[PDB]
Enzyme design. Structure first.
Site, short mmCIF file in Angstrom:
data_model
loop_
_atom_site.label_atom_id
_atom_site.label_comp_id
_atom_site.label_asym_id
_atom_site.label_seq_id
_atom_site.Cartn_x
_atom_site.Cartn_y
_atom_site.Cartn_z
N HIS B 25 22.06 -43.41 32.31
CA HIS B 25 21.72 -44.59 31.53
C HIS B 25 22.71 -45.70 31.83
O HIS B 25 23.84 -45.69 31.32
CB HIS B 25 21.77 -44.26 30.04
N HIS B 259 17.34 -49.24 30.85
CA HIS B 259 17.91 -48.39 29.81
C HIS B 259 18.34 -47.03 30.36
O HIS B 259 19.43 -46.54 30.05
CB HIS B 259 16.89 -48.18 28.69
N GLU B 413 20.70 -35.06 2.47
CA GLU B 413 21.16 -33.82 3.10
C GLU B 413 21.56 -34.04 4.55
O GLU B 413 22.56 -33.49 5.01
CB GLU B 413 20.11 -32.72 3.04
N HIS B 476 9.81 -25.23 -2.30
CA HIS B 476 11.23 -25.04 -2.46
C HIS B 476 11.74 -23.70 -1.96
O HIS B 476 12.95 -23.51 -1.86
CB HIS B 476 11.61 -25.19 -3.94
C1 LIG Z 1 14.62 -33.03 -0.09
C2 LIG Z 1 14.95 -32.63 -1.40
N1 LIG Z 1 16.26 -32.49 -1.72
C3 LIG Z 1 16.66 -32.08 -2.98
C4 LIG Z 1 15.70 -31.81 -3.95
C5 LIG Z 1 16.15 -31.36 -5.24
N2 LIG Z 1 15.79 -32.29 -6.35
C6 LIG Z 1 14.64 -32.22 -7.07
S1 LIG Z 1 14.52 -33.50 -8.21
C7 LIG Z 1 16.02 -34.10 -7.67
C8 LIG Z 1 16.65 -35.33 -8.28
C9 LIG Z 1 15.72 -36.51 -8.07
O1 LIG Z 1 16.23 -37.64 -8.77
P1 LIG Z 1 15.18 -38.77 -9.04
O2 LIG Z 1 14.23 -38.93 -7.90
O3 LIG Z 1 15.94 -40.02 -9.48
O4 LIG Z 1 14.31 -38.20 -10.27
P2 LIG Z 1 14.45 -38.45 -11.83
O5 LIG Z 1 15.84 -38.07 -12.25
O6 LIG Z 1 14.23 -39.91 -12.14
O7 LIG Z 1 13.49 -37.47 -12.53
C10 LIG Z 1 16.54 -33.36 -6.68
C11 LIG Z 1 17.89 -33.64 -5.99
C12 LIG Z 1 14.35 -31.99 -3.55
N3 LIG Z 1 13.38 -31.74 -4.42
N4 LIG Z 1 14.00 -32.40 -2.30
C1 LIG Z 2 17.07 -38.07 17.63
C2 LIG Z 2 16.75 -38.55 18.92
N1 LIG Z 2 15.48 -38.92 19.17
C3 LIG Z 2 15.08 -39.37 20.42
C4 LIG Z 2 16.01 -39.46 21.44
C5 LIG Z 2 15.57 -39.91 22.73
N2 LIG Z 2 16.22 -41.18 23.17
C6 LIG Z 2 17.37 -41.23 23.89
S1 LIG Z 2 17.87 -42.86 24.16
C7 LIG Z 2 16.53 -43.40 23.27
C8 LIG Z 2 16.26 -44.88 23.06
C9 LIG Z 2 17.43 -45.48 22.32
O1 LIG Z 2 17.25 -46.90 22.25
P1 LIG Z 2 18.56 -47.70 21.93
O2 LIG Z 2 19.44 -46.98 20.95
O3 LIG Z 2 18.16 -49.13 21.55
O4 LIG Z 2 19.35 -47.70 23.33
P2 LIG Z 2 19.39 -48.79 24.48
O5 LIG Z 2 17.98 -49.05 24.94
O6 LIG Z 2 19.98 -50.08 23.96
O7 LIG Z 2 20.13 -48.15 25.67
C10 LIG Z 2 15.77 -42.39 22.81
C11 LIG Z 2 14.49 -42.57 21.98
C12 LIG Z 2 17.33 -39.06 21.11
N3 LIG Z 2 18.28 -39.10 22.04
N4 LIG Z 2 17.68 -38.63 19.87
#
Ligand SMILES: Cc1ncc(C[n+]2csc(CCOP(=O)(O)OP(=O)(O)O)c2C)c(N)n1
Ligand SMILES: Cc1ncc(C[n+]2csc(CCOP(=O)(O)OP(=O)(O)O)c2C)c(N)n1
Ligand SMILES: [Ca+2]
Ligand SMILES: [Ca+2]
Lengths: 675, 675
Positions: B25, B259, B413, B476
């Site tokens: 690149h 690129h 996460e 879950h």
């Molecule tokens: C990807 C993912 N990560 C974690 C959880 C665990 N989880 C369930 S509800 C919740 C909190 C969500 O907060 P919010 O969206 O503000 O809901 P509210 O408190 O208003 O009910 C979490 C962390 C999930 N369901 N999905």
């Molecule tokens: C998670 C992830 N998805 C896809 C790729 C494949 N990939 C490598 S470089 C690139 C394009 C990146 O564009 P940019 O960051 O603007 O780089 P530039 O063109 O300026 O060199 C992609 C899609 C990757 N490396 N990682």
């Protein structure tokens, strides 16, 4: 008022459902009941026809709040009752703890994993725009529906929603209307502890329109007006900020404790009396609320009745498009569409399976209008765009049109996966696909798993499948990826070896109605195999080289099938007779009859698997496994294969050792088991 | 000028490296060379001591641009030479196609998968702030270093970077300075096709400071001034917008073609002549550039020399903290720290392993200052915070302090995973952890895989491991998750069954120096086992119940070990004698001696595995496998276990069938193989 009574009914049904289960989430349902009431009164839907293609769609992205959704569906007379609400979160019920589209009538998608639903809504809206651009004509608004999404703080923290919101703003998706439950509470307490960004400023930066409702605990007039305002902004998705109190009305309102556990019994009593309900009664449904909701259903059913007449008139005015639309709404592909699939012979040149995939798409896209798809910024690498097609873009950009068929997802694998689920959820037989490198499908695991659970026929075009990609090195080379997805229920993981197998993989992916597909495709060229066909590869596993006196059978996939065939020749010089099995999709193979499977993997002969990635899963089909259980390397691909002994001689050596290891032993098929 | 000559040298080294490999690149290296020159001239580092704890850190998040990084490291006299550059992308070289911290001196982290590096930079900066708050004293700026990150459009599209940027803004990380390569080109062409958001407005919404450099192809004065400006803003991370031309200087500058593929030979010739280099020469390093860079190295080495004297004086002024700091910089845990690990007997009460984990953390956090960690909005569910500790927050918020030890990651996460990698990369013996539900570790797969490849001792506290979580249901409940991570090289996946096993899992996780850990922990209570100990569980797999006349051995993990013990009693009533093996970590077990492993899984006896998730991988250790290869269900957990026959009677039935299936057969250990 009856509207106030309806809102109280919704709130109390949700709280009573959580109470009966002694499990679940009362806070967001209490806070969002006014908005749910207002949105459903603006929505067009038929509880007796959940698949009407011009319905407005609703998505609960904050899926833990599903007692709210179930209450709405019950009140509107979907195929879900108060008796089902009493079984919330109970084994086997129609009211699971998070909504599942396979099980819950009126649940468009499966939510609960945060961030997914809003992205699904982006996909529903993308599909609606593409569908309307394809079919609508003057005086024929076949498709003019909206996509309404509820989401919370957790969805807004998950990166997948940022990806999809950036893309939705770029795509000017004006029929998407999302509502943020701005209640400032998540599980860890106040959002001040971790989530202090200016959400509204961020959404403006994506090109969304904003409406703010400062008193969403009561102001349904303002919520309805926000929807009207959003509908006037036809070139931007809209975010409606609903400032609510989590658990509104509870003694514990405005606290994290009301998010995710049942209310205390005395709290429920005071809720009921404050709102004019009997504190001794649970699951109350005032007949005036039913009457009001029934009026809206009846009006919506008359709207659908008129739509059916519009569709009949469309079929007369536009005979070709009308028949195509009818076929799609019947869930049927074009008759004999698969005659367009390319077929190869062993005399044809070697081709990478990514290029074979391009060729398939080039032949089938013109024949099957319900195919659309895209790539996550890897179009010239995945080879996912058919020459001559136009991109899906708002015409205002000059870069495409909503009638286009190719989506520029950008570097957004996870949102691409969840958007694909939304496109599938829209319906109308959409068969949609998304390209990236196989190793980065893993970035989208949250959505991929939901494709499987939701039974959506989406397809990943997952190129650069192995160390065969070469110089980009171990950060790009899959090892664990196929094992991960093969271990997930209901994922068809095709790793075609040649041209005929690639056509079989697409036949499966496009015909699918309930199973997502991942097509693992090569960077590097592979030969056309003697013995392959669409017919045999469609069985998922098949005998490529039959050897009646086999000392060993080698089972392989993808790039390793040709390697196995070359190893067979080395083995012949060592006095060892081998057969070869190609196993392009383990799931499809598993679904064949026991007798068919045993004809491929018989008793009485050692079986060695060969695939240049993890050996996990392979003992289903083999006695010994030659795989790659360490990370790869940065170098020219043939040198990497040599380093790891994935050569005809290396395979032959391990095959000979396998024959020797089973000398004097009784060998039964790996397909046998004790239970 | 010499600075102009240095920039040209960098550009041409990168282009010549790509040319020699005929792979890689050149575009971003050409565009970012001025910025790289300017940043490295502001950075404090020692090429002869890559681990100096007060160095500034540099992270190339757009890792495909690594020819640029390697050129800088070569020019500054790291343990990387022009001869290594000539071997760019060649098998076995020190210059792989994406940077790997294990292989490349001066590569702080492993990048290439887009979005990761900026999040790693957030973690390096988080660690630096925590470290400085822990050790700095008046007149003793032990830690005052900066974190510099280069990133491109692709990183900005990936959701993981949004998560980490939101969090970094919230955390007021003023020693983080990121640089966006604003070149408007990605693989699919112009960013107008997919990435039209107002990036700067989005970063302002997160609470970042912005500096814009409109002519970053030439204006190194402005780039240096942007760094000075960023250093004055002590309570915000800074994004520097570098408006560049991709491939600057190439005939193909400003196009997607520059690129990701080598330049044409005639293009390289005109680059060289335009910049005063010999078009017939490759890998030129003008001695004046070396001299200028050497001057900066010599100054930096005098800075480190003075830091060493500051550290010596610190050890006299602050004897306790000085000895603690020395121990950490030596990579050693406190002597006998593991005496704090809780120990249990079979007379103790049943406890969920999530609660056992809380108890471990409560005992070891006060004893081991280099432990910090957090949760992704699941603190009261994962049980990851020790009572009495303060959160890591800027003191200005009133919600914590940078000396705090508990991180509120929010619902993020993936960024949590990549931030953990950055905290580990900082060094100083940090042993850091992150909590979520096991099923949502999958959202972070991109980062988890990099923990394994990068050899970082990070720990996931992954609770609610199975259908045992109950009512939240199949969205879950993990099925595939352990198989996925066990199939990834270099991941220790602990699934402890009881109190002693949970202590062994933490002993492994905290002592780790090169292997990430995932601790799969239960919602539900489990009994303390007769026969468990830290000593035996530390072997990864061990004989829990020895039966010299065994008809079968049952191997199990986690919640299923107690189930196996109960099944043994049912089997005794059927006339079948069983042994039980507990396998809390497959990786640790695999690393034991062959003789030890065979003492656990001997020849001559059928072995049945039991674990309430995918059967993938289990044939390594068993002849027959009882697992769960379908999605779960929403209901009370004991009812789900009964539905799927994970009961003492269901296990016993399958054990009896296994004994019957092997009657008359010769059985050898699953550990045996042909090669
Ligand atoms: C990807 C993912 N990560 C974690 C959880 C665990 N989880 C369930 S509800 C919740 C909190 C969500 O907060 P919010 O969206 O503000 O809901 P509210 O408190 O208003 O009910 C979490 C962390 C999930 N369901 N999905
Ligand atoms: C998670 C992830 N998805 C896809 C790729 C494949 N990939 C490598 S470089 C690139 C394009 C990146 O564009 P940019 O960051 O603007 O780089 P530039 O063109 O300026 O060199 C992609 C899609 C990757 N490396 N990682
Ligand atoms: Ca909230
Ligand atoms: Ca770019």
């Amino acid at each position: 008022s009856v509207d106030q009574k309806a809102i109280s009914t919704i709130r109390l049904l949700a709280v009573d459902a959580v109470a009966a289960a002694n499990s679940g989430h009362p806070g967001a349902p209490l806070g969002l009941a006014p908005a749910a009431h207002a949105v459903f009164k603006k929505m067009r839907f038929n509880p007796k026809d959940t698949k009407w293609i011009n319905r407005d769609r609703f998505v609960l992205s904050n899926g833990h709040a599903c007692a709210l959704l179930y209450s709405m569906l019950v009140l509107y007379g979907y195929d879900l009752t108060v008796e089902d609400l009493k079984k919330f979160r109970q084994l086997g019920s129609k009211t699971p703890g998070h909504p599942e589209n396979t099980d819950v009538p009126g649940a468009e998608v499966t939510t609960g994993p945060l961030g997914q639903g809003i992205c699904n809504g982006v996909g529903i809206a993308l599909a609606q725009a593409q569908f309307a651009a394809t079919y609508n004509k003057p005086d024929f608004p076949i498709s003019d529906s909206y996509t309404y999404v509820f989401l919370g703080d957790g969805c807004l923290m998950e990166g997948v929603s940022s990806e999809a919101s950036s893309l939705a703003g770029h795509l000017q998706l004006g029929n998407l209307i999302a509502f943020w439950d701005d209640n400032k509470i998540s599980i860890d307490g106040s959002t001040e502890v971790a989530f202090t960004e200016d959400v509204i400023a961020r959404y403006k930066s994506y090109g969304w329109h904003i409406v703010e409702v400062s008193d969403a605990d009561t102001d349904i007039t303002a919520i309805a007006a926000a929807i009207d305002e959003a509908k006037k902004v036809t070139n931007k998705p809209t975010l409606v900020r609903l400032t609510t109190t989590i658990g509104f009305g509870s003694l514990a309102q405005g606290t994290h404790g009301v998010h995710g556990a049942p209310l205390k019994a005395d709290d429920i009593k005071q809720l009921k009396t404050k709102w004019g309900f009997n504190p001794e009664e649970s699951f109350a449904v005032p007949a005036e609320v039913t009457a009001s909701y029934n009026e809206h259903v009846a009006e919506n059913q008359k709207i659908q009745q008129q739509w059916n007449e519009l569709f009949a008139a469309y079929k007369q005015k536009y005979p070709e498009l009308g028949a195509e639309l009818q076929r799609r709404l019947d869930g049927k592909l074009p008759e004999n569409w698969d005659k367009a699939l390319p077929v190869y012979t062993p005399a044809d040149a070697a081709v990478a399976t990514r290029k074979l995939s391009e060729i398939v798409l080039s032949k089938i896209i013109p024949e099957v209008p319900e195919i659309i798809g895209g790539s996550a910024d890897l179009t010239p690498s995945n080879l996912t765009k058919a020459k001559g097609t136009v991109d899906f873009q708002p015409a205002a950009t000059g870069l495409g049109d909503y009638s286009g068929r190719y989506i520029r997802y950008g570097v957004r694998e996870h949102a691409m996966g969840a958007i694909m689920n939304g496109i599938a959820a829209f319906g109308a037989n959409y068969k949609n696909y998304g390209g990236t490198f196989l190793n980065f499908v893993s970035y989208a695991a949250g959505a991929v798993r939901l494709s499987a659970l939701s039974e959506f026929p989406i397809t990943w075009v997952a190129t650069h499948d192995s160390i065969g990609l070469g110089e980009d090195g171990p950060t790009h080379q899959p090892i664990e990826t196929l094992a991960h997805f093969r271990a997930t229920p209901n994922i068809s993981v095709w790793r075609p070896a040649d041209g005929n197998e690639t056509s079989a993989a697409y036949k499966s992916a496009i015909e699918s109605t309930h199973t997502p597909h991942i097509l693992a495709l090569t960077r590097q060229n592979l030969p056309q195999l003697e013995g392959s066909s669409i017919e045999k590869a469609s069985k998922g596993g098949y005998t490529l080289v039959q050897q009646d006196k086999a000392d060993i059978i080698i089972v392989a996939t993808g790039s390793e099938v040709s390697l196995a065939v070359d190893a067979l020749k080395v083995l012949e010089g060592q006095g060892i007779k081998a057969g070869v099995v190609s196993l392009p999709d383990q799931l499809t193979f598993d679904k064949q009859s026991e007798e068919y499977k045993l004809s491929v993997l018989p008793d009485g002969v050692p079986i060695l698997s060969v695939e240049v990635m993890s050996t996990f899963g392979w003992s289903k089909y083999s006695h010994q496994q030659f795989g790659l259980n360490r990370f790869g390397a940065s170098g020219k691909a043939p040198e990497i294969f040599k380093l790891f002994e994935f050569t005809p001689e290396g395979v032959a050596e391990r095959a000979a050792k396998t024959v020797a290891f089973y000398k004097g032993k009784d060998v039964v098929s790996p397909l046998r088991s004790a239970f």
